[PDB]
Design a protein around this nucleic acid. Sequence first.
RNA 1: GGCUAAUCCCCCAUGUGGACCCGCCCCUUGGGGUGUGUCCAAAGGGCUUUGCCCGCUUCCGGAUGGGCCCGCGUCCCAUCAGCUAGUUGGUGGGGUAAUGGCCCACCAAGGCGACGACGGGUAGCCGGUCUGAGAGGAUGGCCGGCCACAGGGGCACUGAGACACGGGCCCCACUCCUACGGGAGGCAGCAGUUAGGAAUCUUCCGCAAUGGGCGCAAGCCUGACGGAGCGACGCCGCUUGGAGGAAGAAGCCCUUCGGGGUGUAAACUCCUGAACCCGGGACGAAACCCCCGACGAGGGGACUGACGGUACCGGGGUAAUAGCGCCGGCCAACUCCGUGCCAGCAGCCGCGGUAAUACGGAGGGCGCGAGCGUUACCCGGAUUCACUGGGCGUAAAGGGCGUGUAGGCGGCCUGGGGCGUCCCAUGUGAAAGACCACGGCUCAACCGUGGGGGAGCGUGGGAUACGCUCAGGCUAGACG
Lengths: 99, 138, 124, 208, 83, 99
Amino acid sequence: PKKVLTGVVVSDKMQKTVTVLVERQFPHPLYGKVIKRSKKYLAHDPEEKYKLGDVVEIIESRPISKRKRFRVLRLVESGRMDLVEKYLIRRQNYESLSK
Amino acid sequence: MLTDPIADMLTRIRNATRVYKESTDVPASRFKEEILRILAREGFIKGYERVDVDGKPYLRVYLKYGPRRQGPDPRPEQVIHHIRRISKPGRRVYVGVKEIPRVRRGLGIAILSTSKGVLTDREARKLGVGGELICEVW
Amino acid sequence: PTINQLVRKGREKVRKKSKVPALKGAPFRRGVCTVVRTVTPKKPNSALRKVAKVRLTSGYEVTAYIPGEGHNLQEHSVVLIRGGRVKDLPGVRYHIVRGVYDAAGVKDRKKSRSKYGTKKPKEA
Amino acid sequence: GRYIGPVCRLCRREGVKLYLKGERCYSPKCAMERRPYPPGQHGQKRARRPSDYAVRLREKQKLRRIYGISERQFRNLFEEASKKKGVTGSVFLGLLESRLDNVVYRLGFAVSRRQARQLVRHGHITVNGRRVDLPSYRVRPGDEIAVAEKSRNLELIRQNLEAMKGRKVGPWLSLDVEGMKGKFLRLPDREDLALPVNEQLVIEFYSR
Amino acid sequence: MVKIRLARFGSKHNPHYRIVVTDARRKRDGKYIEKIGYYDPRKTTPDWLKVDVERARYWLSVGAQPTDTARRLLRQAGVFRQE
Amino acid sequence: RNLSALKRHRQSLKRRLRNKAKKSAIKTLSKKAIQLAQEGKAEEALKIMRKAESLIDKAAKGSTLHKNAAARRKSRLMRKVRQLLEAAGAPLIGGGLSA
RNA sequence: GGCUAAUCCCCCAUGUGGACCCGCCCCUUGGGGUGUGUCCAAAGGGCUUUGCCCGCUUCCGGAUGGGCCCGCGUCCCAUCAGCUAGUUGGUGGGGUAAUGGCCCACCAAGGCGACGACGGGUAGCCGGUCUGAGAGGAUGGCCGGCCACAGGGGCACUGAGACACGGGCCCCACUCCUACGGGAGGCAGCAGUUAGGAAUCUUCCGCAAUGGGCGCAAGCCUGACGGAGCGACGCCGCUUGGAGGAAGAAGCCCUUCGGGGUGUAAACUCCUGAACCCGGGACGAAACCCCCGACGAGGGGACUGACGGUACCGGGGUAAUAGCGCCGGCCAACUCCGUGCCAGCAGCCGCGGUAAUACGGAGGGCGCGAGCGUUACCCGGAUUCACUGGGCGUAAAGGGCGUGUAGGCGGCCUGGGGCGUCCCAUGUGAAAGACCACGGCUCAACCGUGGGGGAGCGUGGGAUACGCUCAGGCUAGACG
Ligand SMILES: [K+]
Ligand SMILES: [K+]
Ligand SMILES: [K+]
Ligand SMILES: [K+]
Ligand SMILES: [K+]
Ligand SMILES: [K+]
Ligand SMILES: [K+]
Ligand SMILES: [K+]
Ligand SMILES: [K+]
Ligand SMILES: [K+]
Ligand SMILES: [Mg+2]
Ligand SMILES: [Mg+2]
Ligand SMILES: [Mg+2]
Ligand SMILES: [Mg+2]
Ligand SMILES: [Mg+2]
Ligand SMILES: [Mg+2]
Ligand SMILES: [Mg+2]
Ligand SMILES: [Mg+2]
Ligand SMILES: [Mg+2]
Ligand SMILES: [Mg+2]
Ligand SMILES: [Mg+2]
Ligand SMILES: [Mg+2]
Ligand SMILES: [Mg+2]
Ligand SMILES: [Mg+2]
Ligand SMILES: [Mg+2]
Ligand SMILES: [Mg+2]
Ligand SMILES: [Mg+2]
Ligand SMILES: [Mg+2]
Ligand SMILES: [Mg+2]
Ligand SMILES: [Mg+2]
Ligand SMILES: [Mg+2]
Ligand SMILES: [Mg+2]
Ligand SMILES: [Mg+2]
Ligand SMILES: [Mg+2]
Ligand SMILES: [Mg+2]
Ligand SMILES: [Mg+2]
Ligand SMILES: [Mg+2]
Ligand SMILES: [Mg+2]
Ligand SMILES: [Mg+2]
Ligand SMILES: [Mg+2]
Ligand SMILES: [Mg+2]
Ligand SMILES: [Mg+2]
Ligand SMILES: [Mg+2]
Ligand SMILES: [Mg+2]
Ligand SMILES: [Mg+2]
Ligand SMILES: [Mg+2]
Ligand SMILES: [Mg+2]
Ligand SMILES: [Mg+2]
Ligand SMILES: [Mg+2]
Ligand SMILES: [Mg+2]
Ligand SMILES: [Mg+2]
Ligand SMILES: [Mg+2]
Ligand SMILES: [Mg+2]
Ligand SMILES: [Mg+2]
Ligand SMILES: [Mg+2]
Ligand SMILES: [Mg+2]
Ligand SMILES: [Mg+2]
Ligand SMILES: [Mg+2]
Ligand SMILES: [Mg+2]
Ligand SMILES: [Mg+2]
Ligand SMILES: [Mg+2]
Ligand SMILES: [Mg+2]
Ligand SMILES: [Mg+2]
Ligand SMILES: [Mg+2]
Ligand SMILES: [Mg+2]
Ligand SMILES: [Mg+2]
Ligand SMILES: [Mg+2]
Ligand SMILES: [Mg+2]
Ligand SMILES: [Mg+2]
Ligand SMILES: [Mg+2]
Ligand SMILES: [Mg+2]
Ligand SMILES: [Mg+2]
Ligand SMILES: [Mg+2]
Ligand SMILES: [Mg+2]
Ligand SMILES: [Mg+2]
Ligand SMILES: [Mg+2]
Ligand SMILES: [Mg+2]
Ligand SMILES: [Mg+2]
Ligand SMILES: [Mg+2]
Ligand SMILES: [Mg+2]
Ligand SMILES: [Mg+2]
Ligand SMILES: [Mg+2]
Ligand SMILES: [Mg+2]
Ligand SMILES: [Mg+2]
Ligand SMILES: [Mg+2]
Ligand SMILES: [Mg+2]
Ligand SMILES: [Mg+2]
Ligand SMILES: [Mg+2]
Ligand SMILES: [Mg+2]
Ligand SMILES: [Mg+2]
Ligand SMILES: [Mg+2]
Ligand SMILES: [Mg+2]
Ligand SMILES: [Mg+2]
Ligand SMILES: [Mg+2]
Ligand SMILES: [Zn+2]
């Protein structure tokens, strides 16, 4: 079974490509707390069909390019910019801690 | 607000029994009531009943104690010697059926929340399901 | 610490510093003496302890103790050293192994011979 | 090693009369019938209250010197017994009693366990017909411990088995004196052994 | 090719062989595909040779090649018997 | 002081010269055909593409241009020729290309 | 420069079939089918010789082996906080068995990072192994799996497969030959030499067994392997005697000078018989092969042992190595003399300056025993990095205070989803090891056979109490 994840499109600034952020909950291996991790996957959008905020399913695919190994299966739900804003604020905080 | 309502109820019961109160009022909730059902069924309390304070619904837990003891400290033996919350917010505890603890080698209970309702260690073990390890009582 | 703190920071494993930096973790090390001096002990004791500043094949030059009643260790004596410190001598963390390459065993030793490099005497 | 040397000095040091020479530990010559104090210059001096480690070590040494088994084999047998299911002490005793030399002693073929060890090592004992010369050999229930047909003419065997006429054997052993053989019927229970040892003391000694 | 041969598993002067299906390019004591029998050359026990006949027939059907010794041991177990 | 496995080396050299030749032909012919397809000379283009495909398969007979890789070269050649003639038209000789 | 053969190379033909362009159908990424067009096949040899055997060619499938891709897991330093130009993506190409920014043209400006990028340091990884009640900590030697490397660096050729340890090329360092022009070489294969080091082996035997390569076979090769050798390095088995033997020799040590101790210990008496000396003397070895049959099934026959005259069996047969540490407390074992803060001991506390159970020797004792000690290292105890399982008023520890970002956590009621959670079924979890049972070397170590396991992850189905999410509602928190 080819892995099928579900995430949020947070970057449509590339050509025929979208950055889908995928979260996952799991108990900590030693401390048992259900912790939440995440990972960004570069998925293939050959029709520019999906835009920012779209929650979409992603499927393991034949490699399209270096770092691009997934295709957008279908659209789970339309643009919800709240998770996108959360990710953008997380990124924007990085400029405040340099020196 | 309360961060853990269930632990709040358990601590209310602990603090009440430690001074030999008659009953204690806990803010009412279906989950708390389902736990109190197991409590009263197992004999740790005389029972519970829904009540109303000035505007809001509560649960009166009627506590249980042993006979008055002799010698110094005639205070009776506690029926609930120990009651501790396990699956707290921030560290939730889930166990399979083969991972349910035998409390006090039998003399205690462990309250679980399973997909088939709120059960005890022996009840869940007989049912064959596991879940969230709410609290241990003995 | 809270569970969330342990997920963020985690417990810190404690590492133990080696009391015997004879490099490569060796149990013994060969060296050549530099000086064979006499050191006075610390607070409660008083004696003349026999110490030798051994220059090791490990690259170090450290002082090591010369056990036994008598010794024969000149300046250019080649001796082997082992762990084990002398408490009443600050800085002396190593012992000379008696019976190795220049250091004869303590003569007339009869009780604990293997610890001072003295072979079994002849017929009884 | 086998500790080989004086033995009745252990009869003295352990405080309990041991039987390491066979006879002469029954005769008024054991040096325990006449000198019950431990050996050495300081044997007759007033004893101090022994530590708990002292008590457990003395009891374990008593039980170990009774059989003449070295520390290596002793600790190995004990760990083997602790691995098994059941009471560690009784199983350990059943293991020690299952040794071929000890069985030869118990069957009256030899007067002492060390004499039995020499009888085994010199191939004078057979197990189920086949010759066996290992004291550490473990006898199973049902094994027939016999005397070699070529050794049944020896003077010592004649003496020992001529004295065994009329003597009873352990409840877990059978003896045929005419055929000069016997059978290990079962493992001995704790109630079958009259050893002056507290097994729990040895268990606690190795528990450290 | 895939072969059916013996592997040595006993100790020194105590040889015990596993009749085994493995790639010829692998070492004789290395990772085999399946153990299809065992062989004791010194005949220490009354059962000193056992072979799974159906499995040997399968591996021969798919294209395995046994050694001369392996083929002898199989023939003794009636792998090729068609009576 | 060495063993006669040097013989193998010798053989490789021969085979090397055998391979480099065939490929050097194929490549050459391919280019030639493509030229005629760019200039519209369809008859000669297909007539040379036939010979190119033949040399490709003949090289595939041995260890020179084995595997498919030969089919890959044939595919790319036929595709490029048919595409370049479509910019002009009139597939005159009707050679390798299907109707 | 010249001659020549082939299972060497080439051309044409035959098109079972396959390859490719295009079209159609099914299927859904480049899978399968179909039509026209085009393109592609081959090698002979041996006999028991016109019939078989070893082969050859094209195609489909199996089997085995592998390539590539993806989820999750994989040490320390944040006294490394910003990294990135083939960088991220696209289009079109080149390349490969195959995807890919692998490579290259052109276009777009992206990609990664406190959920720790980048940098630095360290390190093959795992099955396992050691320890631990467990959780965990430590480790990855032998054996098995995967990786990487072959003096350092780079590169292609040949091939089903290599960027090739005992193949090739170039640069560098090194060694050797040298007619000074130029060449040869690569133990991290077995053994051995040397250097370093506290320290690690024979320049041994054998193709008999197992396995591998070539060959129809005979057979050839195999420092793979099977054995032997050396080293108490480890584990296991065994010996240095057994029984009798004085109110108790001598010597030696204490002493109230009565005696006490070494101690049944010895000498001795009787008995067995480690070593050795003879004789017998293996299993491992029945296949390939040959004959019959049918070169099949089946039957029969013959050859072959390095270990090795070893194991083992029988007879004969001598009382025949014991050492090392400790004895103030922790910690089992005490006296005498010598020494006089000297000489020395010591893991920690500590002992020695006149009468030391602590130094040194003696007698005696305790502990282990072909070992005993020491040093080094790991886990343990250590609940002393505390998930299980700790703390912060005065013992080490609440930030000087606030505002607040991310993050963590979230009152009551109903419903949808089923992400966490839970259940069932199933796949996976190589072997070895670990556990249990039986069995083979006289036991054991060692080994064989069988049994049982197991988290995690994949898939199918199910549960909805709790946590999650979405939709709605409430007012006890909060705000007004
Ligand atoms: K845990
Ligand atoms: K930035
Ligand atoms: K056709
Ligand atoms: K090579
Ligand atoms: K045959
Ligand atoms: K004999
Ligand atoms: K005899
Ligand atoms: K002096
Ligand atoms: K002393
Ligand atoms: K402060
Ligand atoms: Mg998401
Ligand atoms: Mg876009
Ligand atoms: Mg692309
Ligand atoms: Mg689970
Ligand atoms: Mg000198
Ligand atoms: Mg037990
Ligand atoms: Mg046990
Ligand atoms: Mg392989
Ligand atoms: Mg059979
Ligand atoms: Mg068949
Ligand atoms: Mg060659
Ligand atoms: Mg050749
Ligand atoms: Mg050209
Ligand atoms: Mg090629
Ligand atoms: Mg010529
Ligand atoms: Mg056709
Ligand atoms: Mg043709
Ligand atoms: Mg050819
Ligand atoms: Mg021809
Ligand atoms: Mg003919
Ligand atoms: Mg790149
Ligand atoms: Mg491309
Ligand atoms: Mg392409
Ligand atoms: Mg290639
Ligand atoms: Mg990057
Ligand atoms: Mg992350
Ligand atoms: Mg490294
Ligand atoms: Mg354990
Ligand atoms: Mg563990
Ligand atoms: Mg590791
Ligand atoms: Mg390795
Ligand atoms: Mg390995
Ligand atoms: Mg080298
Ligand atoms: Mg090189
Ligand atoms: Mg190189
Ligand atoms: Mg080839
Ligand atoms: Mg390589
Ligand atoms: Mg190379
Ligand atoms: Mg080489
Ligand atoms: Mg060369
Ligand atoms: Mg040297
Ligand atoms: Mg060797
Ligand atoms: Mg040879
Ligand atoms: Mg061979
Ligand atoms: Mg062979
Ligand atoms: Mg070998
Ligand atoms: Mg031993
Ligand atoms: Mg005696
Ligand atoms: Mg005699
Ligand atoms: Mg035979
Ligand atoms: Mg042969
Ligand atoms: Mg014939
Ligand atoms: Mg036959
Ligand atoms: Mg021979
Ligand atoms: Mg004999
Ligand atoms: Mg003491
Ligand atoms: Mg000392
Ligand atoms: Mg130490
Ligand atoms: Mg004096
Ligand atoms: Mg004195
Ligand atoms: Mg003293
Ligand atoms: Mg002494
Ligand atoms: Mg040791
Ligand atoms: Mg430690
Ligand atoms: Mg710990
Ligand atoms: Mg603990
Ligand atoms: Mg610490
Ligand atoms: Mg804690
Ligand atoms: Mg603390
Ligand atoms: Mg403050
Ligand atoms: Mg938040
Ligand atoms: Mg917030
Ligand atoms: Mg809630
Ligand atoms: Mg939330
Ligand atoms: Mg619901
Ligand atoms: Mg679910
Ligand atoms: Mg296993
Ligand atoms: Mg374990
Ligand atoms: Mg057995
Ligand atoms: Mg299971
Ligand atoms: Mg499911
Ligand atoms: Mg439901
Ligand atoms: Mg709401
Ligand atoms: Mg107000
Ligand atoms: Zn006695």
